Amino acid sequence: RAVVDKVFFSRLIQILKIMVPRTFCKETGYLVLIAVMLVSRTYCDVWMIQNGTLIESGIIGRSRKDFKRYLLNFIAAMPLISLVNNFLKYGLNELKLCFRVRLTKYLYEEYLQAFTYYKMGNLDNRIANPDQLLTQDVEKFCNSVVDLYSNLSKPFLDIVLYIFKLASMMAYLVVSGLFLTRLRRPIGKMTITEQKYEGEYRYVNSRLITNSEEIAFYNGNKREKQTVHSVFRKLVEHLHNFILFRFSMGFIDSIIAKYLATVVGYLVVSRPFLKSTHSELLEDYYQSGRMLLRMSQALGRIVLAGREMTRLAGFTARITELMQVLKDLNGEIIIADNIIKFDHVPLATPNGDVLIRDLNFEVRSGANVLICGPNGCGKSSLFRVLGELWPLFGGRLTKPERGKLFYVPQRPYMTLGTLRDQVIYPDGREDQKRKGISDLVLKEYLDNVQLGHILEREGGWDSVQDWMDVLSGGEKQRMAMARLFYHKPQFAILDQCTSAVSVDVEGYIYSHCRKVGITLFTVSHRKSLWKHHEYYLHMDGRGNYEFKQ
Amino acid sequence: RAVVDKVFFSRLIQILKIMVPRTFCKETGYLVLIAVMLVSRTYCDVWMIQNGTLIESGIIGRSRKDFKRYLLNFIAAMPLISLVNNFLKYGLNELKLCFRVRLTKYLYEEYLQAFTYYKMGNLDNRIANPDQLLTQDVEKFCNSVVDLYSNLSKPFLDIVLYIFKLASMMAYLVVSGLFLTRLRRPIGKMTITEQKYEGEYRYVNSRLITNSEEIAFYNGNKREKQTVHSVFRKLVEHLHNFILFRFSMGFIDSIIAKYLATVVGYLVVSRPFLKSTHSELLEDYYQSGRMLLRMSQALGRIVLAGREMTRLAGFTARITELMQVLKDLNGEIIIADNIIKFDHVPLATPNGDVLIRDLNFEVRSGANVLICGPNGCGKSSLFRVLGELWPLFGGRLTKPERGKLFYVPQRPYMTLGTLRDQVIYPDGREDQKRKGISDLVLKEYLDNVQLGHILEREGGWDSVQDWMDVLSGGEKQRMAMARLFYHKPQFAILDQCTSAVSVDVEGYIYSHCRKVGITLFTVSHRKSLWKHHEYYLHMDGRGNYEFKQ
Ligand SMILES: Nc1ncnc2c1ncn2[C@@H]1O[C@H](COP(=O)(O)OP(=O)(O)OP(=O)(O)O)[C@@H](O)[C@H]1O
Ligand SMILES: Nc1ncnc2c1ncn2[C@@H]1O[C@H](COP(=O)(O)OP(=O)(O)OP(=O)(O)O)[C@@H](O)[C@H]1O
């Protein structure tokens, strides 16, 4: 699940392809910039030592100009040195930000393209809490993928650069890579579960905040505290195992990489010190052996920084799993114009179970339909099948496209934004007038909001600082009623518009509905709205339905 | 405001005390362990450089035996000298985890103690997205606070333990910390706003996930994509200025801290080399001024690591606001026993508006009350005032208690967990039998769930893998009806029981309700449930009521 091998590299290439898509794109200039201002640094660090070993020597004898004037160059190279360092830093962080932007854009365009933000979750249980796998996991993956750059690549143009100056068979990375890896697999395995627990904790908090009024009424403070501490203590308890494992890792990661590296370096550098027969004043080692031990230290630092690789396997496994949002692919629907038909389609829940297995009926744009029954017999699930929310697993089905068809769900929804956008949820604001017909929001909508909605002076046409769906009350489902009269659909399908009002304004909405060519298809548990309806289509929990007039 | 000054230190102390309660706690020993394993680690380098200079001095000659016997000591010390480093590493992040645990526990016990998880937000708008400020902000703050240790403390004692061997007037921190800070102020406010934008982005994603079905029915994929990409681009556009400021800061921060420090060290160390009269073979500089330039490097590194201080100003200035949940302190309430009184109490919304100002009614244990009226006239807001959800605002009222009372909110709520816990939401499971009367879940609760709930075989008494409030349907509000009969309160204040079956189950619930002595206080828009009710108390949108029979 986090093993570093061929499959991991393939699963990393398949996600790197979508980022830096082309040649010399907007962000491919950072793979070159941090490939030129980074090598310039590793030529500027040997120069740091070279001036370092030639400055103190200057101030040894009674020489002032050999240090005063000599030191000046260092002060002259300080601006360039710092500029190179910070240019590398900026290139790195800008590259990670651009990587994140591209990955997020791809994931979103692939994640809201259809009824897939709904299927992930309520329909399919394969990924838990997707609101964190593409908001916090993407950021961490972008941060880590670049940090495997500049580390395992920064001490890479330091072995070759030192090799430029230079029998050295000290390729002990062969035995310190096969070892010191495959011993760090638990880090990759359990970074995934740490992320999972963090996501669950955050989701519990968010759910508590969301329905913070129902919980308040029930006085469930103690129960909610218990059920949150249950998942918090399930997190830190695991972090203790994770944190204590990194200690057991550093012990072997600091006696085979950071310290034993210098031991082998000393062992190899001093092989020809028992040709250079005499090398009278044999301080040449300071310019040919010191560099060798520095190279050995960098070679050890390579594998030492290889730690970030396995900690990235978990992130890659998590995100590459989120790229099973290709369920966009994994009976038939006929695109009719005026008649909604149901040819022996057994409606069913997402799992395997049939509520009503006949559903042999149809409607036309001349007879408002009202359907009733007990609570829990494929009533609100009929629309989910008619709409592309649930599968069909049946015969034929016809509907008037999707533009000339409106749905009001069983539960209210007020989008976040301005009041105007509440009347127009789907289209938006620019489409409201520019792309489509120009509706005078100043005046044309007050008639569309003639449902007794006095909440127009209550905030003005553009009120968002004090707006939400926790403020309207029970009239936020008749605010959805003032959405048909703007969308003017050929067919309107209403799921429990009741609970708005008994008689004061319930009749007004329906009277206006068939004062326009809006054929109605409603569910309601009432006897005071049958006057403006024609057909019956009554169904019960016995698996059979009665279609009458 | 994230300026590093007296107020910041005061605010850091006031929240440091809550994670160091007593002397030698479960984590107060980590301030000792990482204080002796850290000073025992600065004995590694000093021992490393001394030995490091020792070996090759033994290989300048051809003494194989000397080098061998004087290298084995390094092999022997490798285990201890790596164990010390890794023990510092473990004691470091274990301390941050403990800090996080204590801070989270305090914040939660202070945040779920009353109806404050509700007041924060719906009632008060002072903190936005409280679900991220105690889930992600706390973790980052704990990580940062310790990282100001081992950095500004790791090099702190590398200055006193180098002074152990030593005219050192190079105290230029006075001019390099007064400068180079107050020139980094933007980082604090800018990390604060970055955290704000990240929280808003995550909240938008969570809100999209929560009511995904409603969004799917409206076909609002395009609108939701637009409103998400609007706040994502509002974030990365700011991270661009953030990482374009760090480089603009790193430039100045790497020519006054990391390289000019070396220049000043070379300048000061050279003063005597111009009273060491002759010191023939002046190699003593390798141990009498090399340490001096190392000390200057560490002194520069102190101010360089001072960067984490200002980046920690933002987190502290953020969390200190979340510790304004002291609104728990921010008319009259009388604990009567059997009368829900209302003496000239003007019910009002959280803001400064009044809906009805008389409210001079009362009820008794033998008079069920059903109230109605238009939609949007303090109907469901009467309970929010009767219950301690909204301010009393004046007048007087008396209620029996909070234990022998019940509220069914207008919107349904099924807590996450098992099916059994759905019936017992507030009390939980342990209290279901131990702290209170023992109810036989296998048999006793079937009669308590005699409301037509056929979901006895549907998952079993303990089903959580396939449970949620997005699965029940219209029966998740009458599952709250099969939750009043278990609490058996004095009065049952239920709200919008409608959308349950009109006749099949509506009559059964109310007939059973008055069989047991639970006086019903209900709001509904119906005529089929008025038979089992006594008093009108009709409500209107003109601030008046009747209270007839
Ligand atoms: N996600 C789901 N998976 C499986 N079964 C579900 C799911 N959601 C609901 N159900 C069950 O499937 C059937 C759906 O009933 P349904 O929601 O359609 O009608 P209705 O909505 O019951 O009428 P009402 O709105 O009044 O409750 C019921 O058996 C319901 O309990
Ligand atoms: N948080 C809030 N702040 C200010 N006003 C609110 C808030 N919530 C609701 N309101 C408004 O306050 C009044 C309370 O209405 P209320 O919720 O009481 O309607 P209702 O009585 O619940 O009727 P119903 O349940 O059918 O709507 C209404 O004016 C409502 O629009």
Residue numbers in the entry:
A (entry chain B), B (entry chain A): 56 to 221, 231 to 338, 347 to 402, 431 to 649
Q: What's in the article?
A:
Human ABC transporters ABCD1–3 are all localized on the peroxisomal membrane and participate in the β-oxidation of fatty acyl-CoAs, but they differ from each other in substrate specificity. The transport of branched-chain fatty acids from cytosol to peroxisome is specifically driven by ABCD3, dysfunction of which causes severe liver diseases such as hepatosplenomegaly. The overall structure exhibits a two-fold symmetric homodimer, with each subunit containing a nucleotide-binding domain (NBD) and a transmembrane domain (TMD). The helices TM4 and TM5 from one TMD are swapped to the opposite TMD, i.e., domain swapping, which is a typical feature of type-IV ABC transporters.
In order to capture the substrate release state of ABCD3, we prepared the cryo-EM sample with ABCD3 E596Q mutant via adding 10 mM ATP/Mg2+ and 0.5 mM phytanoyl-CoA, and solved an ATP-bound ABCD3 structure at a resolution of 3.2 Å with C2 symmetry. In this structure, the two NBDs dimerize in a “head-to-tail” mode. In consequence, the conformational changes in NBDs are transferred to TMDs via two pairs of coupling helices, and eventually make the ATP-bound ABCD3 exhibit an outward-facing conformation. Specifically, TM4 and TM5 are split into two short helices due to the conformational changes, and the first half (lower half in Fig. 4b) moves towards the translocation cavity by ~13.7 Å as measured by the I273 Cα atoms. Based on the density shapes, they could be tentatively fitted with a pair of CoA molecules located symmetrically in a positively charged pocket, except the missing cysteamine group. Compared to the phytanoyl-CoA-bound ABCD3, the binding site of CoA is localized deeper towards the cytosol.
